[PDB]
């Protein structure tokens, strides 16, 4: 599986069945981008957790 | 001061000098980014710091 | 003033008012602990600021 | 298998097989901890990674 990683195009270890993409907002000021390969989502992001090709843009 | 704040304007407190734009990148997959008001600012170390209001787009 | 800022003691520029501590949580595995001097501590609640010396933790 | 994840032990998914914990620190004032369930790490990460019930505590 290949998974888009912050202007890469990544190719995921064994292990690692999905890509990912999302957004966090901990504070007011910082916004952080998560975006490669991974593990399983949590029920509650299922849908950030996608298994094609670069799907994560 | 008033500065932009992630897609929004907001009033810094009234001893904050500075607006401020800031990325980080601690990870291949992640990626940080700051942008607000405050009290210091060293425009080596950021992408912007400025001290009008509405200078940190 | 003097706040922690992760296992260094520094001292508050004089537009830095309060000792501030924040953490957040986007993602199941990602904790982000921001602490250090903050007059953003400007809510009139004990919440992420505390007034009194080396008070943030 | 079982890990810490932040102050609370959790049962990873069937394609997690390690469990984690790392640190990094874009900027003095912010700290990022990385810890629970994960796949496989990197070649540079190996030591982050075990195997065994909570052994990321």
Avoid: A
Avoid at 42 to 50: F, G, L, P, Q
């Amino acid at each position: 599986l290949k998974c888009y990683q912050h202007g890469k195009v990544v190719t995921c270890h064994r292990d690692m069945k999905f890509c990912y993409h999302n957004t966090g907002m901990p504070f007011r000021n910082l916004k952080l981008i998560l975006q490669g390969c991974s593990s399983s989502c949590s029920e509650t992001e299922n849908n950030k957790c996608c298994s094609t090709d670069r799907c994560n843009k």
